[PDB]
Design a protein around this ligand. Structure first.
Ligand SMILES: [C]C1=C([C])[C]=C2C(=[C]1)N([C][C]([O])[C]([O])[C]([O])[C]OP([O])(=O)OP([O])(=O)O[C][C]1O[C](N3[C]=NC4=C3N=[C]N=C4[N])[C]([O])[C]1[O])C1=NC(=O)[N]C(=O)C1=N2C(=O)[C][C]C1=[C][C]=C([N]C(=O)[C]2[C][C][C]N2C(=O)O[C]C2=[C][C]=[C][C]=[C]2)[C]=[C]1
Lengths: 666, 133
């Protein structure tokens, strides 16, 4: 869309209706008359628009009002109410802008934010933007978390997030404007090379891909249409379903071959019966002939009964000859029909061995995308977030995604090398206990009104706990933690003195020989100004590869490419980096996924904040104290940078509403 | 609402591959084998049929007899009548044969004949005799 409606859309909101959230803040309006709803919407939309149209500077109520026109410039509270809603909830004046009203003189409230991810960073800025006092604590010696970007020389390569999945309705769009990140579209063409090192004929390539897509929908069909979602008391993985579907396709092939050859035998049998009939006829004919021959021996002139024999015998013999000529007729057809059936054997197989392997690459890809084995993915829910896909082509960040965190981090109180160990929340407030990463023994205590936790789900899942909650988190929280899935995916980075591959092409695939190793180095990216080739390890491979020397890993890397580009062409790489996120203590994986037996609703449970019990018994119910953000907390945008960022904006608003009160909801 | 084109997924089938860990392979093997049995069975009949073909070799062409062309003349020779009666006796009602044997009478003529001489050839008697066999 374009115009104001564009702005709604670019803000992930329906232009013509009020959201559940708006309903909560403007319950007067939405229970109100349609006319007013319409006004509201326009104001909201318009207001969005102006921010969007310029996001490098703060959009103030005055400015906003200034540009509105009556009827709409008519009601100033409505405007102000709206503008503040948008502002509180990060719909505007979020990211990096030039402040018009310099910062509130004295701050109010104090929040401790665990983790300097994008989730953290974004919340922190938001809060600070709201005059709160915020400190971040990060175990690492840098910001950005799983936005990790490697820089050396003019080498640049993200080990972390790499891609921007579409700018249509993506917050990073604004951030892009707000920051010079150089964005590069990703040319879709990706060519595959079997283990031999031979490209894969366009023909097979398209055949298989389409089967793959074919195969996916199939699963969807079982899931919804046959409701094949539980098997033997346990939930069905997308992986099981694919197997079942495949088996079934194989069954069908057999099934059809059988039926074909069965058609043959029956035809072949039917002919057999004809022959017999034919052979006997010849028998009778042969003999009848004799008899005629004999009777015609009796030379005329003959008595009548003797004349009769000849004639009658003669007739009988032509009869049979007629009868048999017919069969010879029939037999001809049958012979020929059998002749066609051997012509048109139904397909020999569902998939060649070579066929299975290209397919596997496609499955590795899915595994790369979801950062997990499809065995683990929920059949029913693994793509639940599919509806909220952005629009536009995918992009990569030519200068390294880290620029973003870094940019976000500017202006903020961040403590690096500080590892949280314990979070205590109680009615009066919270204390967070951390240590210096460099020397464990040196200890810090931070007191604050609220804690925002952006520890990764991986970290949350750790047994025994890397971080301790006091009191322990409620079971509803912790079960969701068990249930959700935290995947793994790894990058290997190869830096070269010269480009030896097609610059025209962004990415290309290698096809593994085994199904077990479809993950292993299955895909390669060239995205950077330097000569850098980046290679994914995905699927079950990822986990396993983590226990293997970089050198070996690089070995396989070079191998593969020598095969593809010829052994003289592939120089030793000047610089190499390999990642191992499941290993990383502050990540313990790459991103969340919907494990089989979980659902999107778990994501919602993770975002639900925690309210400590009363300090003195029978004192009234507190404020909540412990808040969660991060990629694993946002059901509609899980597992992404924009998702994390959004979560962070979310909680800041929630927190601000709580500790600063929201004066806009009457 | 419907499986993607040429994907086959049936309630019945699905339950069937599902039922135990190896059930999938069980069913695939049953067919793998089952098919082979048909394949072989084909080759028998192929061989069988081939041998029958050999017997039938040479067609019947040696045993064919020249066709005769008979103008479907109006009159009955006594010879012609005599043949008829005999024909009846051998051939029941199959008037086609009978015309065929007499060689120069219309099939009508035969029935034509039948009623016509029924009296003096006791065709009833003849018929019944021909019946008794
Ligand atoms: C790992 C990783 C890698 C390697 C790669 C990647 C990733 C990852 N991703 C994700 C991201 O990264 C994330 O999410 C973010 O970053 C998050 O953040 P947060 O939450 O904030 O967190 P962090 O960062 O971690 O932070 C935290 C902190 O904390 C701390 N700590 C710990 N512990 C502790 C601490 N402190 C203190 N104390 C203590 N104790 C730490 O340190 C830290 O700092 C991604 N994303 C994105 O966006 N992008 C990208 O690219 C990236 N990557 C890649 O390559 C992949 C990913 C992805 C995936 C998927 C997607 N998509 C989706 O999902 C979907 C949805 C709907 C649609 N879609 C689509 O379309 O797509 C598909 C695709 C795939 C692939 C490619 C393209 C496309 C996206 C993405």
């Amino acid at each position: 869309p374009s115009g104001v409606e564009g702005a709604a859309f670019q803000s992930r909101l329906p232009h013509d209706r009020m959201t559940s959230q708006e309903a909560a803040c403007f319950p007067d309006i939405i229970s109100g008359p349609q006319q007013t709803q319409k006004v509201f919407l326009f104001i909201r939309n318009r207001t969005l628009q102006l921010w969007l149209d310029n996001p490098k500077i703060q959009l103030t109520f005055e400015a906003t009002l200034q540009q509105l026109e009556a009827p709409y410039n008519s009601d100033t509270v409505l405007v102000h109410r709206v503008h503040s809603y948008l502002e509180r909830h990060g719909l505007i004046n979020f990211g990096i802008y030039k402040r018009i009203k310099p910062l509130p003189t004295k701050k109010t409230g104090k929040v401790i934010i665990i983790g300097s991810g994008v989730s953290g960073l974004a919340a922190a800025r938001q809060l600070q933007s709201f005059g709160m006092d915020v400190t971040l604590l990060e175990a690492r010696d840098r910001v950005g978390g799983r936005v990790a970007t490697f820089r050396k020389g003019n080498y640049v390569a993200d080990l972390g997030a790499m891609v921007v999945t579409g700018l249509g309705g993506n917050p990073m769009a604004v951030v892009s404007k707000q920051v010079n990140m150089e964005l590069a579209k990703i040319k879709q063409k990706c060519p595959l090379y079997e283990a031999n090192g031979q490209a894969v004929p366009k023909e097979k390539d398209e055949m298989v891909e389409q089967e793959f897509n074919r195969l996916l929908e199939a699963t969807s069909y079982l899931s919804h249409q046959l409701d094949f979602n539980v098997l033997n008391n346990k939930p069905v993985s997308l992986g099981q379903a694919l197997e079942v579907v495949i088996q079934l396709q194989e069954k069908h092939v057999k099934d059809e071959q059988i039926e074909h050859w069965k058609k043959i035998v029956k035809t072949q049998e039917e002919l057999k019966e004809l022959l017999n009939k034919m052979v006997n006829l010849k028998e009778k004919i042969k003999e009848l002939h004799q008899q005629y021959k004999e009777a015609s021996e009796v030379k005329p002139p003959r008595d009548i009964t003797a004349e009769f024999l000849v004639k009658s015998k003669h007739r009988d013999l032509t009869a049979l000859c007629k009868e048999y000529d017919e069969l010879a007729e029939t037999q001809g057809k049958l012979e020929e029909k059998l002749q066609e059936l051997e012509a048109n054997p139904p397909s020999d197989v569902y998939l060649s061995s070579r066929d299975r392997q290209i397919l596997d690459w496609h499955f590795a890809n899915l595994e790369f995308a979801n950062a997990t084995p499809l065995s683990t993915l929920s059949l029913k829910h693994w793509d639940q977030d599919d509806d909220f896909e952005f629009t536009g082509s995918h992009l990569t960040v030519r200068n390294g995604y880290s620029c973003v965190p870094v940019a976000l981090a500017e202006g903020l109180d961040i403590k690096l090398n500080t590892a949280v160990r314990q979070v205590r929340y109680t009615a009066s407030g919270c204390e967070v206990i951390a240590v210096n990463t460099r020397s464990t023994s040196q200890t810090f205590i931070y007191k604050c009104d609220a804690v925002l936790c952006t520890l990764p789900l991986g970290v949350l899942k750790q047994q025994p706990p890397a971080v301790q909650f006091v009191p322990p988190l409620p079971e509803w929280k912790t079960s969701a933690v068990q249930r959700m899935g935290f995947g793994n995916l790894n990058k290997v980075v190869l830096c070269f003195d010269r480009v030896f591959w097609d610059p025209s092409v962004n990415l290309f695939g290698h096809v593994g020989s085994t199904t077990a190793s479809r993950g292993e180095l299955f895909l390669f990216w060239n995205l950077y100004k330097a000569p850098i080739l980046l290679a994914l390890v995905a699927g079950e491979a990822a986990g396993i590869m983590e226990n293997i020397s970089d050198d070996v890993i690089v070995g396989r890397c070079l191998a593969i490419l020598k095969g593809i580009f010829g052994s003289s062409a592939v120089p030793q790489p000047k610089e190499t980096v390999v990642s191992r996120w499941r290993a990383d203590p502050w990540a313990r994986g790459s991103y969340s996924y919907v494990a089989a037996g979980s659902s999107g609703n778990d994501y919602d449970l993770m975002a639900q904040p925690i309210t400590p019990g009363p300090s003195i018994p029978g004192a009234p119910q507190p404020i909540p104290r412990l808040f969660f953000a991060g990629e694993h907390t946002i059901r509609n945008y899980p597992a992404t940078v924009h998702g994390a960022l959004l979560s962070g904006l979310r909680e800041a608003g929630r927190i601000a509403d709580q500790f600063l009160g929201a004066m806009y909801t009457l | 609402r419907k499986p993607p084109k040429g994907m086959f997924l049936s309630q019945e089938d699905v339950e069937a591959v599902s039922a135990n860990a190896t059930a999938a392979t069980t069913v695939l093997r049953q067919l793998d084998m089952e098919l082979v049995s048909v394949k072989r069975q084909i080759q028998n009949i192929k061989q069988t049929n081939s041998a029958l073909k050999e017997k039938l070799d040479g067609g019947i062409e040696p045993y064919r007899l020249p066709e005769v062309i008979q103008k479907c003349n109006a009159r009955w020779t006594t010879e012609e009548q005599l043949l008829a009666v005999q024909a009846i006796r051998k051939y029941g009602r199959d008037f086609q044969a009978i015309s065929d044997v007499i060689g120069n009478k219309s099939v009508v003529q035969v029935k034509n004949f039948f009623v016509n001489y029924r009296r003096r050839f006791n065709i009833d008697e003849v018929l019944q005799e021909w019946e008794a066999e």
